[PDB]
């Protein structure tokens, strides 16, 4: 069996994305659900043997699990001080890079 709560998908902001990454669909589980092509469901969900195994391949091995991400990655530690220095460094290196490209070419 597999526990979907410990698969790292619990912090997905969008419910639809959360369900898709979980391999689950409450809409398709109902026996009155109808396909866009007009086919009615047979009562199964996305996977019939789910519950027996706990989840489908989507929930068994997710490739996008934001729960296991590092909290330190949610913000830049240096803050506005780093960004201003980063912005200034970008301009300085951009000018040097352009000048070096121009100087070392047959242009003009």
């Amino acid at each position: 069996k597999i526990d979907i709560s410990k698969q790292g998908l619990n912090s997905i902001q969008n419910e639809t994305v959360k369900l898709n990454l979980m391999g689950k669909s409450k809409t398709m589980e109902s026996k009155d659900w109808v396909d866009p092509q007009g086919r009615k469901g047979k009562g199964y969900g996305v996977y019939r043997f789910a519950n027996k195994y706990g989840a489908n391949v989507d929930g068994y091995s997710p490739i996008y699990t934001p729960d296991t991400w590092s909290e330190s990655g949610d913000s830049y530690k240096l803050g506005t001080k780093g960004l201003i220095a980063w912005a200034g460094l970008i301009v300085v290196l951009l000018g040097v890079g352009i000048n070096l490209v121009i100087s070392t070419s047959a242009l003009g």
Partner: protein, 38 residues
């Protein structure tokens, strides 16, 4: 500090454009300069 994350789709879009730009430059260079038969 500054809290936030770059959206993944934006990273793919910008990286996708850069790759397409790089390939376009290679095809541009196929018609000019060295190797262009001109």
């Amino acid at each position: 500090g500054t809290t936030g994350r770059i959206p993944l789709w934006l990273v793919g879009t910008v990286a996708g454009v850069a790759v397409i730009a790089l390939v376009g430059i290679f095809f541009y260079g196929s018609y000019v300069g060295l190797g262009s038969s001109l």
